[PDB]
Design a binder for this molecule. Structure first.
Ligand SMILES: *[C@@H]1O[C@H](CO)[C@@H](O)[C@H](O)[C@H]1NC(C)=O
Ligand SMILES: *[C@H]1O[C@H](CO)[C@@H](O)[C@H](O)[C@@H]1O
Length: 336
């Protein structure tokens, strides 16, 4: 049966009794999750109008959906509006107010999310911990955060996941466009990323799952961002990153690093000295091109001893800025 809800309490009470759930203009109570977990397999969820959220300092999530064979859709013109400026204080998840993560897709398996627009997330947007989940035509509009104190507004954080496909995302934020902390068989294609910290593998290490395998980030553009292409592995951690491909990536307006691969990463600041417990093997860059800003570095590779091997880099051409004086343990066939 089809059900339309204009309040969160009714939707939560009746979600398992509905095979199509329409969420129309819901104001989600402060400090609570719009909890659409535990759906019956096959259910379709449609967001309509503007979903809003009450103000409270808490960790979230604002929205959570789970189940098998779930189809999540944003209707034309729909928005999930976090009004994140109520929390933004320049400090994100590193300090200041406690700020709620936006959208949990944990165990949203053999499922899809299409056409969702998120506006002004308080902090990170999608937390993905699922198998066989596609996210298509997603828009993250956090542009207000450029001037109003947005920080740590990651669009897609992935861990403990398999068979994730992200297609035609459009992101304007202040942190990673994608951050693959762990996972296997992951595709990001057709994306436009602006404002943030780039298309990132990692940080990898220091968690329960520190394994990244078979990831393709392709046919995408990164503009007006701190980094273009980034792989970050945690200083002193243990894990592995293998079979990663960046292909057909264009970048411009990059402030810090066009391409940065570093094995000294920490959330506060990298140490400057890499370690070798998170090997990066079978990394392919194919046709990664564009420009960096005058004060940026084109390519920076800071690998540990023996922990970067079997790389294939072809068609890499990054102009502007300066060449790095700091690269370490650069593999055969690769250059800064
Ligand atoms: C790598 O991942 C892609 C997409 O998830 C998949 O189509 C492909 O079969 C995977 N390769 C292997 C060897 O599993
Ligand atoms: C959720 O919605 C159903 C109708 O779909 C109600 O019967 C229930 O009481 C709750 O309001």
């Amino acid at each position: 049966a089809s059900c339309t809800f204009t309040d969160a309490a009714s939707a939560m009470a009746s979600k398992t009794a509905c095979s199509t759930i329409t969420l129309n203009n819901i104001a989600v109570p402060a400090g609570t999750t719009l909890d659409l977990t535990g759906l019956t397999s096959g259910t379709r969820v449609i967001f309509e109008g503007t979903t809003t959220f009450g103000y409270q300092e808490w960790s979230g999530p604002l929205v959570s959906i789970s189940g098998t064979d779930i189809t999540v859709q944003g209707a034309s013109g729909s928005v999930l509006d976090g009004d994140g400026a109520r929390w933004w204080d320049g400090q994100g998840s590193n300090g200041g107010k406690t700020k709620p993560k936006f959208f949990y897709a944990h165990s949203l398996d053999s499922s899809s999310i299409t056409g969702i627009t998120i506006k002004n997330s308080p902090v990170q947007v999608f937390s993905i911990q699922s198998n066989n989940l596609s996210l298509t035509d997603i828009t993250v509009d956090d542009a207000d955060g450029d001037t109003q104190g947005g920080h740590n507004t990651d669009a897609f954080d992935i861990g403990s996941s398999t068979y994730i496909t992200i297609t035609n995302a459009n992101v304007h934020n202040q942190d990673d466009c994608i951050a693959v902390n762990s996972g296997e068989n992951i595709i990001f294609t057709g994306g436009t990323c602006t404002g943030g910290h780039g298309l990132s593998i990692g940080s990898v290490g220091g968690r329960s799952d520190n394994t990244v395998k078979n990831v393709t980030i392709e046919h995408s553009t990164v503009t007006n961002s701190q980094n273009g292409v980034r792989i970050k592995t945690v200083y002193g951690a243990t894990g592995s990153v293998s079979e990663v491909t960046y292909s057909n990536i264009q970048m411009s307006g990059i402030a810090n690093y066009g391409i940065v691969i570093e094995q000294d990463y920490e959330n506060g600041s990298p140490t400057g000295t890499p370690t070798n417990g998170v090997p990066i093997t079978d990394l392919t860059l194919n046709t990664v091109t564009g420009s960096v800003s005058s004060g940026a570095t084109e390519i920076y590779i800071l690998c540990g001893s023996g922990s970067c091997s079997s790389w294939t880099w072809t068609g890499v051409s990054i102009t502007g800025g300066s060449k790095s004086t700091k690269c370490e343990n650069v593999p055969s066939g690769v250059s800064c």
